[PDB]
From Swiss-Prot, chain A:
The name this protein goes by in its record: Probable proteasome subunit alpha type-7
Major site of localization recorded for this protein: cytoplasm
Posttranslational modification: The alpha and beta forms are probably products of the same gene with different post-translational modifications.
Lineage: Eukaryota, Fungi, Dikarya, Ascomycota, Saccharomycotina
Subcellular localization, as worded in the UniProt entry: Cytoplasm; Nucleus
Organism of origin: Saccharomyces cerevisiae (strain ATCC 204508 / S288c) (Baker's yeast)
Assembly and binders: The 26S proteasome consists of a 20S proteasome core and two 19S regulatory subunits. The 20S proteasome core is composed of 28 subunits that are arranged in four stacked rings, resulting in a barrel-shaped structure. The two end rings are each formed by seven alpha subunits, and the two central rings are each formed by seven beta subunits. The catalytic chamber with the active sites is on the inside of the barrel.
GO BP term, pick one: proteasome-mediated ubiquitin-dependent protein catabolic process
GO molecular function: mRNA binding
Swiss-Prot record, chain B:
Cellular compartments annotated: Cytoplasm; Nucleus
GO cellular component term of the entry, any: proteasome complex
Organism, as annotated: Saccharomyces cerevisiae (strain ATCC 204508 / S288c)
Protein name: Proteasome subunit alpha type-3
Organism lineage string: Eukaryota, Fungi, Dikarya, Ascomycota, Saccharomycotina
Subunit structure: The 26S proteasome consists of a 20S proteasome core and two 19S regulatory subunits. The 20S proteasome core is composed of 28 subunits that are arranged in four stacked rings, resulting in a barrel-shaped structure. The two end rings are each formed by seven alpha subunits, and the two central rings are each formed by seven beta subunits. The catalytic chamber with the active sites is on the inside of the barrel.
Curated annotation (Swiss-Prot), chain D:
Family named by the database record: Belongs to the AAA ATPase family.
Posttranslational mods: N-acetylated by NAT1.
This protein's name: 26S proteasome subunit RPT4
Domain of life per record: Eukaryota
Functional summary from the UniProt entry: The 26S proteasome is involved in the ATP-dependent degradation of ubiquitinated proteins. The regulatory (or ATPase) complex confers ATP dependency and substrate specificity to the 26S complex.
From Swiss-Prot, chain G:
Gene3D superfamilies for this protein: Glutamine Phosphoribosylpyrophosphate, subunit 1, domain 1
Coiled-coil intervals, chain numbering: none
One GO term (biological process): proteasomal ubiquitin-independent protein catabolic process
Keyword Cell inner membrane: no
Localization per record: Cytoplasm; Nucleus
Name of this chain's protein: Proteasome subunit alpha type-2
Miscellaneous information on this protein: Present with 7060 molecules/cell in log phase SD medium.
Entry keyword set: Cytoplasm, Isopeptide bond, Nucleus, Proteasome, Ubl conjugation
UniProt entry tagged with the keyword Ubl conjugation: yes
Pfam families: Proteasome, Proteasome_A_N
Family: Belongs to the peptidase T1A family.
Protein source organism: Saccharomyces cerevisiae (strain ATCC 204508 / S288c) (Baker's yeast)
Function text: The proteasome degrades poly-ubiquitinated proteins in the cytoplasm and in the nucleus. It is essential for the regulated turnover of proteins and for the removal of misfolded proteins. The proteasome is a multicatalytic proteinase complex that is characterized by its ability to cleave peptides with Arg, Phe, Tyr, Leu, and Glu adjacent to the leaving group at neutral or slightly basic pH. It has an ATP-dependent proteolytic activity.
């Protein structure tokens, strides 16, 4: 027949859920954002699109942190991931409440993928319109994960989502080749900044703001934290030079 | 959304009808013809085993005539399965009623009991009704022998005699023709058998094609005695009709 | 010895070595020996799979019984083997019993010992429960009678076999009884009859698949 | 469709015969080259060629390439 | 030469080959053809020693709607 | 009406297309995987495909260790894989907890199959479009192979494969097994058995495989585990020798 | 989430029909032809073990399954549906009967109980009827041997013998031909072999075929000794050997 | 109608028997041959 898409849990005649696939639509539409696992740790980079001067700088913050070691960022409908994020914040809490440890990134990774996939399991459950790049330093190093409304996430040497991901995925692939060694968080900070501007070239039509956060076994000790001030401004001009 | 999938069972016809109820009734037309009669001295129960065969085992088989109590047994027009549900329930209900009052249930109470139960699906739940209607044969203190009926709608009446399943109008005609108030069971027996043989859609009316029972206060009695006839007994009385 | 292979194999060897008759001391012992379990299906020893394998001898050993004429031994034992596959499986009887006797129809036998034992086990069907293709045996018995040229015996049996096979018993067999019956008629030179029977068969034969032999016949 | 091998096979066949650097990224493209056909492989070349004429390349450079590759892996698989 | 068609082989034979000597005017082969099915014909047509005529419904497609059946008769 | 397509209810033909469509999402990930009982052991070989550098390849697996003893490989959407594995993982411990001993492999499959069977019958539940493959060395059964479908249907296997070309691999082994007449590989060392399979994997796929190319897992007595790329390559070494 | 299909999924046709059931019957008819025969001394059921691949190990799939030492079941239809019903059937038997009465229910009630389930599927929302019908044979003390046939209608009735699945019509045809009252199981066993042979297309043998009986109690199978009252299960499953043994007896 | 087929086969027999003279026996076969078909599909 037809209209298989018209209800979530339905399998398409080819066995697919177009709703999720449609949810994927706005995901791309979601603000381009990336993440990087550097040598010790991970870095989370996202463009903050400036809609207007009435927006107050730095105030509306995209990247969200789970526990204290896990940052998360997503292209898509903000309230979605937020809603999800809270659940993750719940998850780790329960996890840590039970396990006394902060949660391993992959552990944390898994739990969500279920909860997302749960929203693939019912025609009444609206899949998620977001894909979160997320991770942090954990017991064993860091990890870099981006979870799809499909309920699929993976380990990522680098990760990107939203519009400009291609420009990103380009640059990420490069740095992989530029630095199969690894990367210093600092350069991880710096390079992402360039990538973002480059990624912004798709959305170049409007001005934006740049938000980048990171989790460094070294620099944040394994905490997850924002890039701020000079170091933030550094990568900016570092990129703002390199963009030219 | 779930809405797509609801047949919306209980919704009214624009004419204020319930087609499921209508259609349930319709399947009952397809149900094996079942007849019952309240004689002066008793109540007769005869129904056609429908869809029969050689290796079909008759003796244990009862697909139609079931005993709720020793003062209440019933003939079933409809899905064998569905009734057995209600059959069991009513028994309990009666048993409860018995266990409540240490006294047998006046039949209608049990009847009306099932009546609204059917009606339960009628007015709520989005649940298909039962495709079953019943001949309610019972003896009470109050009215003595009582011959009731029910429809999936739960609407129900008393009868001096009644038929259900196929050929009802035909039977009803024959019944409403040949019946007379003072008829003795054995008359009604053959009378039904007469009506049966005639209203029989198959060639011959034969025991192996029939279920038969009676409610009678015996000659040595004070215990109004229900009896289901054995195939031979049916076959025997089958001869006594001259039907042979 | 003592082993399902060994003795049987010895009984097989002592044939391969020399003969069944030496091997019979093992063969007889096969029946006399080898198992701790199940039923006494061996006529002496109590066994299950062994007897089946003792039969494996008793097949050969039967044609060796024949090669002895201890078919005459086995003749009477053929009743016992019946009870012995009754000590195992009544159907397995019907297989092996028939098998054996047919193998005694092989390795040339007097019609008698066949008839004699057939007629035995034919009844030994009934005595057990079996109305069931004792006629098949009886067919052969009739065939024996046919080979005995007892067509009276045959046809009389046959007509029963017929009335049996007339859908009181098998149509596929009912095909073949005609064939024998036809031959019977044919040896009696009753042509239409033989024809009819063959014809009825042949037409009825088309309803199923028939033995290529039968088909060829 | 050609396997990752078959692709890489066809890759260095259809593609590399267009003038290209060794800088031009041979397997990693193939790595990102998945569910392509023989002409899709050519598209991969042809697409980078856009970037080539966009980067002024007779020899395709890895720059031209994997932009295309994803871009090739973009529209469909 | 497609093995085992006897009943069908006899059937055609029953259908045509025999009545050619001695009743149907026409016979229908049904199934996938050229499977041996069409091969039935030629094989039959071979033995038959009569003037064979193959025809294709897929042949009568000439604009000249004037001729059409004309030899379809005379053929 | 035509919603029967959309939901799980008998077609006019008595069919569940959501199920049959879920059978699509099975090979959707396009991984040809296999499982063979070795002599003492059982080995699963599968395609490990990495489309992207930016991925972590190591994070990519459809072979999941359900228990100490039981590993499982999945064919279908990774989320359902990530979903189903946990479900299984929940069972064994609880089975182990409830029943004092680790769940024998089939039981899991039998258990898991029910869920699909539930999803099969339940409407609001969609089934999962993954086919599951359960092997381990069962203390009672030694090597054992069990594969479940979205239908809740499953069976034991002398050996089995899964994927788009599963059909051919099936043939190859059938031929081989008919040739061998034996249900399991005679090879004692799964090492060989791995190489054996990879051979027949390479064979029936006509495709050579590098260390990254393959996802591999090893069912051993009391333990399931998965090989490294080295172990893979190690096997890849010797196969290059025999072949 | 939160199943909002609470509404009966199968609804009475304008013609007063339940299509899913009908389609279940359709699917049931599609089922592998499977039979049962109630003889004098007992009852036998039979079906062809279906191999969708020789790599698969047939025995690992059991279409016949004991419900009680005197009761076992078989189906024609979707294996999985049959699978879960077995457990419930097994369970409800213990719970609703044994865990009450300390024993194994008379064939009818369990059957009556089982069918109850299948009905529920037909009626309650969110669920579809099962893709099988059931040939169920059991011996009880009072009703002795009995053989039942349950549909997705949840309807059930006894048989002298019967078959379900595809060739069942042809089977039942030949069954009626063959069947008599006085058939002893072994002949009936043999009969079933004959009968199912027709429904059998590919290889016919104990490895292709699944046979079991309701027989006399089997103290060996009782797994222990010392209890006079319990002489063991009447049910048993038949070995390919025993099968192929009697397939010689064909 | 089925009767006709019987007759035809009787002749078909007889024709195959090379007979414009049909016995009863032929019919008696066609019965089956038709009741073959009658029992067939």
């Amino acid at each position: 027949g037809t209209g298989y898409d018209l209800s979530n849990s339905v399998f398409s005649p080819d066995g697919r859920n177009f709703q999720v696939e449609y949810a994927v639509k706005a995901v791309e539409n979601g603000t381009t954002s990336i993440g990087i696992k550097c040598n010790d740790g991970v870095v989370f980079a996202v463009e903050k699109l400036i809609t207007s001067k009435l927006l107050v700088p730095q105030k509306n913050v995209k990247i969200q942190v789970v526990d204290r070691h896990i940052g998360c960022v997503y292209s898509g409908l903000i309230p979605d991931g937020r809603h999800l994020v809270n659940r993750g914040r719940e998850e780790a809490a329960s996890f840590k409440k039970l396990y006394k440890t902060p949660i391993p990134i992959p552990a944390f990774a898994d739990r969500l993928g279920q909860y997302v996939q749960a929203h693939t399991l019912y025609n009444s459950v609206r899949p998620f319109g977001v894909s979160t790049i997320f991770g942090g330093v954990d017991k064993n190093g860091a990890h870099l994960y981006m979870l799809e409304p499909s309920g699929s996430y993976w380990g990522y040497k680098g990760a990107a989502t939203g519009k400009g991901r291609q420009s990103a995925k380009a640059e990420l692939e490069k740095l992989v080749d530029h630095h199969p060694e690894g990367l210093s968080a600092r350069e991880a900070v710096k390079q992402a900044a360039k990538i973002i501007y480059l990624a912004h070239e798709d959305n170049k039509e409007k001005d934006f703001e740049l938000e980048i956060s990171w989790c460094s076994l070294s620099e944040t000790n394994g905490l997850h934290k924002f890039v701020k001030g000079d170091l933030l401004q550094e990568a900016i001009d570092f990129a703002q030079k390199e963009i030219n | 959304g779930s809405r797509r999938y609801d047949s919306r069972t209980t919704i009214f016809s624009p004419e204020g009808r319930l087609y499921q109820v209508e259609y349930a009734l319709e399947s009952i037309s397809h149900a094996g013809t079942a007849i019952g009669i309240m004689a002066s001295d008793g109540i007769v129960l005869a129904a056609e085993r429908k869809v029969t065969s050689t290796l079909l085992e008759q003796d244990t088989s009862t697909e139609k005539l079931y005993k709720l109590n020793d003062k209440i047994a019933v003939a079933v027009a409809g899905l064998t399965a569905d009734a057995e549900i209600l059959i069991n329930t009513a028994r309990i209900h009666a048993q409860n009623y018995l266990k409540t009052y240490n006294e047998d249930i006046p039949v209608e109470i049990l009847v009306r009991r099932l009546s609204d139960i059917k009606q339960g699906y009628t007015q709520h739940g989005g649940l298909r009704p039962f495709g079953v209607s019943f001949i309610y044969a019972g003896y009470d203190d109050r009215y003595g022998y009582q011959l009731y009926t029910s429809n999936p709608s739960g609407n129900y009446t008393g009868w001096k005699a009644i038929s259900v399943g196929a050929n009802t109008s035909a039977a009803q005609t024959l019944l409403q023709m040949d019946y007379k108030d003072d008829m003795k069971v054995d008359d009604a027996i053959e009378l039904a058998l007469k009506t049966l043989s005639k209203t029989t859609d198959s060639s011959a009316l034969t025991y192996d094609r029939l279920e038969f029972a009676t409610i009678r206060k015996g000659a040595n009695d004070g215990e109004v005695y229900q009896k289901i006839f054995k195939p031979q007994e049916i076959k025997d009385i089958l001869v006594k009709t001259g039907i042979t | 010895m003592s082993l399902p292979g060994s003795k049987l194999e010895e009984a097989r060897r002592l044939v391969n070595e020399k003969q069944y008759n030496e091997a019979e001391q093992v063969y007889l012992s096969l029946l006399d020996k080898d198992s701790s379990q199940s039923s006494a299906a061996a006529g002496a020893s109590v066994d299950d799979k062994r007897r089946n394998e003792q039969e494996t001898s008793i097949l050969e050993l039967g044609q060796l019984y024949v090669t002895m004429g201890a078919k005459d031994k086995l003749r009477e034992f053929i009743p016992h083997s019946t009870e012995y596959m009754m000590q195992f499986a009544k159907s397995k009887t019907v297989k092996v019993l028939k098998t054996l006797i047919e193998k005694f129809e092989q390795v040339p036998d007097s019609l008698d010992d066949q008839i004699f034992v057939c007629e035995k086990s034919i009844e030994f069907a009934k005595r057990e429960k079996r109305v069931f293709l004792k006629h098949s045996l009886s067919i052969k018995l009739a065939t024996l009678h046919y080979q005995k040229k007892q067509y009276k015996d045959s046809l009389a049996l046959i007509n029963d076999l017929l009335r049996e096979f007339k859908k009181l018993d098998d149509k596929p067999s009912l095909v073949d009884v005609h064939l024998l019956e036809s031959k019977v008629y044919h040896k009696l030179r009753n042509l239409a009859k033989s024809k009819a029977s063959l014809t009825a068969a042949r037409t009825a034969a088309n309803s199923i698949y028939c033995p290529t032999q039968t088909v060829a016949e | 469709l050609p396997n990752e091998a078959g692709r890489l096979e066809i890759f260095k066949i259809h593609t590399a015969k267009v003038k290209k650097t060794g800088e031009f990224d041979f397997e990693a493209a193939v790595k990102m080259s998945d569910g392509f056909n023989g002409a899709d492989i050519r598209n991969c070349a042809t697409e980078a060629g856009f970037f080539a004429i966009r980067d002024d390349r007779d020899h395709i450079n890895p720059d031209d390439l994997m932009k295309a590759v994803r871009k090739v892996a973009e529209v469909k698989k | 030469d497609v093995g085992g068609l006897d009943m069908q082989k006899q059937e055609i034979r029953e259908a045509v080959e025999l009545p050619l000597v001695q009743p149907p005017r026409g016979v229908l082969l049904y199934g996938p053809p050229g499977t041996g099915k069409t091969m039935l014909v030629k094989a039959v047509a071979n033995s038959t020693k009569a003037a064979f005529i193959r025809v294709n419904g897929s042949e009568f497609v000439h604009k000249y709607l004037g001729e059409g059946p004309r030899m379809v008769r005379d053929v | 009406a035509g919603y029967d397509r959309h939901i799980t209810i008998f077609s006019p033909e008595g069919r569940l297309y959501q199920v049959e469509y879920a059978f699509k999402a099975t090979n959707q990930t396009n991984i040809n995987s296999l499982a063979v009982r070795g002599k003492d052991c059982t080995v699963v070989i599968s395609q490990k495909k990495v489309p992207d550098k930016l991925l972590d390849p190591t994070t990519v697996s459809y072979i999941f260790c359900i228990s100490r003893t039981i590993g499982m490989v999945v064919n279908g959407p990774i989320p359902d894989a990530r979903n189903a594995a946990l479900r299984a993982k929940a069972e064994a411990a609880e089975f182990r907890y409830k029943y004092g001993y680790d769940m024998p492999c089939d039981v899991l499959a039998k258990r898991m199959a029910n869920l699909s069977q539930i999803y099969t019958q339940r409407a609001y539940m969609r089934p999962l479009g993954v086919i599951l493959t359960f092997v381990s060395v069962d203390e009672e059964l030694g090597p054992s192979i069990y594969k479940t479908d979205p239908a809740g249907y499953y069976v034991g296997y002398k050996a089995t494969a899964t994927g788009p070309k599963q059909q051919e691999i099936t043939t190859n082994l059938e031929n081989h097994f008919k040739k061998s007449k034996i249900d399991h590989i005679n090879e004692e060392s799964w090492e060989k058995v791995v190489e054996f399979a990879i051979t027949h994997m390479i064979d029936a796929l006509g495709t050579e495989f590098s260390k990254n190319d393959l996802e591999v897992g090893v069912a051993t007595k009391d333990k399931f585990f998965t090989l490294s790329a080295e172990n893979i390559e190690e096997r890849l070494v010797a196969i290059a020798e025999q072949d | 989430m939160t199943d909002r299909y609470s509404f009966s999924l199968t609804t009475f046709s304008p013609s007063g029909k339940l299509g899913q059931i009908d389609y279940a019957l359709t699917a049931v008819k599609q089922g592998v032809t499977s039979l049962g025969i109630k003889a004098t001394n007992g009852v036998v059921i039979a079906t062809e073990k279906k191999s969708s691949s020789p790599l698969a190990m047939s025995e690992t799939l059991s279409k016949v399954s004991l419900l009680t030492p005197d009761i076992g079941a078989v189906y024609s239809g979707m294996g999985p549906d049959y699978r879960v019903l077995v457990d419930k059937s097994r369970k409800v038997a213990h719970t609703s009967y044994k865990r009450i009465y300390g024993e194994y229910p008379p064939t009818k009630l369990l059957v009556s109980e089982v069918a109850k389930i299948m009905q529920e599927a037909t009626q309650s929302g969110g669920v579809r009827p099962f893709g099988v019908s059931l040939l169920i044979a059991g011996h009880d003390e009072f009703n002795g041997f009995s053989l039942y046939q349950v549909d997705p209608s949840g309807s059930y009735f006894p048989w002298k013998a019967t078959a379900i699945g595809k060739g069942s019509v042809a089977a039942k045809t030949f069954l009626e031909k063959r069947w008599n009252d006085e058939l002893e199981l072994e002949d009936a066993i043999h009969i079933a072999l004959l009968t199912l042979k027709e429904s059998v297309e590919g290889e016919f043998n104990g490895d292709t075929i699944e046979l079991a009986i309701i027989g006399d109690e089997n103290p060996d199978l009782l797994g222990y000794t010392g209890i006079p009252t319990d002489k063991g299960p009447r049910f048993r499953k038949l070995t390919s050997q025993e099968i192929n043994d009697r397939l010689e007896a064909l | 109608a089925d009767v006709k087929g019987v007759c035809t086969e009787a002749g078909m027999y007889a024709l195959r028997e090379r007979r414009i003279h049909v016995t009863q026996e032929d019919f008696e076969l066609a019965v089956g041959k038709v009741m073959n078909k009658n029992q067939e599909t």
